[PDB]
Amino acid sequence: KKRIRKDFGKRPQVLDVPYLLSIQLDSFQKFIEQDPEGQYGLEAAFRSVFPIQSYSGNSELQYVSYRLGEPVFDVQECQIRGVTYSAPLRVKLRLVIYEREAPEGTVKDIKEQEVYMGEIPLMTDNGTFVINGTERVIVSQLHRSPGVFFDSDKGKTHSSGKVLYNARIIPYRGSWLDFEFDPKDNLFVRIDRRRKLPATIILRALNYTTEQILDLFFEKVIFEIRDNKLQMELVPERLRGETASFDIEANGKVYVEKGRRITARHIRQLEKDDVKLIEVPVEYIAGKVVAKDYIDESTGELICAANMELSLDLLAKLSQSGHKRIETLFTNDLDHGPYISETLRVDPTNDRLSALVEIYRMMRPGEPPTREAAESLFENLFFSEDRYDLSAVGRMKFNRSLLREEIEGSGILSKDDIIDVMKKLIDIRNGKGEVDDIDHLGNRRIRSVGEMAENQFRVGLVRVERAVKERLSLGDLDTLMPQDMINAKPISAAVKEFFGSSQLSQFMVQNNPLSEITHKRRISALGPGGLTRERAGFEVRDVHPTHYGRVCPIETPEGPNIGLINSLSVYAQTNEYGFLETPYRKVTDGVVTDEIHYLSAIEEGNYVIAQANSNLDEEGHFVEDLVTCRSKGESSLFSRDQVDYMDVSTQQVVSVGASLIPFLEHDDANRALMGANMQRQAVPTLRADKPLVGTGMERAVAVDSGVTAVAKRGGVVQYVDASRIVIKVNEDEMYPGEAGIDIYNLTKYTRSNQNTCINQMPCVSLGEPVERGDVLADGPSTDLGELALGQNMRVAFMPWNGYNFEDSILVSERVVQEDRFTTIHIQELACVSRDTKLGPEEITADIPNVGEAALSKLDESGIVYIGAEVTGGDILVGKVTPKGETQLTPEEKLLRAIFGEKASDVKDSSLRVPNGVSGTVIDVQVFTRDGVEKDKRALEIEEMQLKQAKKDLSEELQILEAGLFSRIRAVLVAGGVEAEKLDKLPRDRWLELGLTDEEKQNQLEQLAEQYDELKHEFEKKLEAKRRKITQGDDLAPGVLKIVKVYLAVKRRIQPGDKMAGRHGNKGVISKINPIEDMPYDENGTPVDIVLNPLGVPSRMNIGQILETHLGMAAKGIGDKINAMLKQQQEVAKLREFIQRAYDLGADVRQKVDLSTFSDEEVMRLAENLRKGMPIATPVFDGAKEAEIKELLKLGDLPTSGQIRLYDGRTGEQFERPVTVGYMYMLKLNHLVDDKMHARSTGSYSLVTQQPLGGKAQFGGQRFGEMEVWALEAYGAAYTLQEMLTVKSDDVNGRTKMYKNIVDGNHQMEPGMPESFNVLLKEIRSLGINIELEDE
């Protein structure tokens, strides 16, 4: 018997979501192949800098293969410690020397294998980078293809600017190249977006004469001179949009008479008769423009030069001369406008020389151009990779713009590319052809992380390459390979700048596993100063119809940026050369194949693709002949015979952040935006509980990403600790003995970027054969293998009492009594000691001006131990700082040179706990510079570890002794019984006592070998520990050691915390009302969280309600199959209740009949839907208004949805039932800004008297002009007066005021504010003068 999985929406998922880290791994892997050879990425940039050719030396540096050396540390010491992690870059180089100077006899090929050049960071096993200390991730970029386009018009916004077309080239590095027209029908060119210049000034520089230029924008019309008359090679297509200026006749048939216009009908009449020769007057040719030069072949005089317009006089000589081939230009008044013909006239330049010079000054105005500089600059504009490189993909996309055949070529542009492009530009301006699609993905290419890393790497190369040429001469003979050539400085200063200062790259969001994976798989529209800014984007923010199943049109962050980012969808993936190709199931005839194929954005429009919302039984039949199908933007009804391809599922349409949303189709894009962001702002909660409605992506995020630990090789688990999970692999014989030991470290309490804590609680128990791919430990919020951000509580939508006004949330008092929302927060308080004017600072516990409880928790080094119950006021770091002769008193100066120097020279300057927060120490930082001597700091902790390690052996040797000796006794007694005799002599003598010849003696012998062997292994085990502790020391980028104490405060649910579900209903907790007033059902179970029903009419998000009815009726829909049919097989006291209480509720033939099916039958009927424990609901193809209602009458208890409750205050019958259930909500993390900012009297600035915060004292709130006009509006005068006087600036005001309030009286009237003084003084010093006047 075989059946269906039975779930909401019939959309079988054939190909599960691939690796989500395919955007980071695949890209950065091909970029820098550490393990593999050398190809693509960095290698594609080495063959453009290493091949250096410096004259007067003849040196050729050949490239071989690059191999990344040894890293710094692992991946855990980059967070718990202060490791920057920087892996050096070494490449194999084998250059040859051909000296060309004085006869020295130096000829050899010395091979310097590895050479250190640049320090580029690497990617973690997941897809993140580390530079300074915090996790840093590079977001991909998306802009217009580095080639050519044909938009509408620009620059003419102020004036009219009618009927004007133009083209634009948007490179990545170099100068711009534009081509626009003016009302005078003239074409120009903009280099680097500067002043306008003739569009024929760049052509002449490319070795193009006046005659050639004319034959690059217009077609040539050959005129023949025979029988003393003028003919012409007639072309019907060229007569489109022209008036008959003559009698167009051929073969004695007048097709078009003089007078009437030439329509599209007369054109086909000429193509049919194959008319390619007619008679044309002289006036018709007079309106044309001669291409080349034509001189009289009878006299030798010039008749007319090039570019010059023909006339009735010039043509009169061209006919008498004797020419037979007249090559001119074809121009009319419509689809062939003389634009270029009028460009050569307005061009000052006349050749190549005048062009190169004119451009040089236009680019670098100042020093007089030369013969070599003028040519060098021009070649470095659009004809050199070291200054202008359109990558290796730009060429491909540039070819499809001019309808080219091949797609391969060079990165730089040629003299034929620009010309061919300008040809189409004229066609559009004329009338033939239209514009191009910009938003189309065919142009907007995605820039992978690898490529991005190469972008900031190619820049550092052209900077160091300018130094290897000079230093080449500084080399003696053949030793200029190591450091005597290349410098790893210009490169580092170019790459490091992008990993921090760059706006494109920002801090990694690690407040949640799901929030991390959505950061890597993210696309950005902002980048270098060669693209777009933040001021404009009304053409890039808006999603284009072509962006289907390749990017979620509603995955952009909510706040300052809306539509500027937008992450990447699910199934979509950056293929090979930018072109994003989303999977499509190839379906032949009426049979769907399980095969998948990645179609291009330009190839999709060539085939008709069906949809996922179509009914399908299996994969060999089709439901209905006529089904809704889509093409490339339109909608039409196609048959199952016309359908060539079909979408994979309703998942590729959105991202992983929106795929988790149960009812996304029921939600509007408006609130759906925030709904995906609420998951991005999630926070690791204690009680991790998975939603009561999963889609099938909660288990993919944890596995693929670096969230859940995965075994390396199958084996048998022997032990399971919270900090480590050792796996005894049976590489040899099957025995409990040690063999393939592979320790797995689980990150417990380490500080992340969003001040969160990532944990990994082991799941595997004692003795459990694990398989390759099985889970070993959980994650920050994962339960077992799936994802669980928030929790599941009882929700009851009802306007309580004012509290839930706008976006407020009411929760019972039981929420604080239990740590269900108690999250872990970690704050870092760095304390650095720098050089003082009196000498370097010291880190000791000797700090005066403190209490006993302060130095109590502190050791004999000033650093507090681990696990201290610190609080607001306690000292975390024991730092000291000298005072100065000015701060010294004659009393403490005498004892300074008597009782020693270290008596009263230093003062109190330690790091304390910020006012308000109060937690405990979880991790202390240990550093001690060798140049500053290893004092008691690195000695005490060391001694402690030596004592612990020694104790770790005494305990192991105790169990090993009392574990084997307790076994050899039961063997010795057998045969040679010695009860009262064996318990006398020492334990080490029990080995000397033999036993009668027998196989039993062999046992005692083996146990004697195991004792010595194992013991010898534990002795050396302690030795290894006494090495790492007393070996090398790692320091921080700081100076004089750094003590970083991490504070952890239990952040309970208090008024101010914001929570939201997965629909977009964001709100903040109001007041924690007791379980007294809050309503409750007739069967106890009080309501946990209450929302406002008014958040539905305005905020269009009905979907959230669908989840409510799904949570309440979850005890009778799909979860019922696994909450009754599964529990009855376990407990024998339930199998008697489930079989009867089931049929009484659900009488559907489709459902499983417990009465008919046996214990074995039902078991297999619960494995088909095991993964979907809390039912299953896809994105845009799942639940239905008809399916849901039917599933609510199958189980307990209410009907139709709503149910009659009771008021918690009154207790009477609640008028009319209400919608209740279990909605899956989510708590949002608490940012630093959430921390209360209390300030009353702190420190002030120097130049200005404005209060300034920092570490201890909190920063004061600003009172902008906006707030100024507020009090300025009211009749109040003294309020706003002191607001910017006694409060802040005025120094004499903050003193008198405080001295008056403490007395009991009022403060003296505001005198002269500091602002009045400072400003006034800034005037007297000038030429003017301001003076206050009385009445």
Place this chain on the structure above:
Amino acid sequence: IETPITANFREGLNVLQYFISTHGARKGLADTALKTANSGYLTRRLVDVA
């Protein structure tokens, strides 16, 4: 657009109609995006005058 939408929020809203409404959904939220940064820009031009 010449192709209207029939499906609504209640019933099964396909991926097509949901994509169409996104066009008009991008505008609204992208408007207040630059106003929340500095809403005292427009007011400044008036207050400093009268």
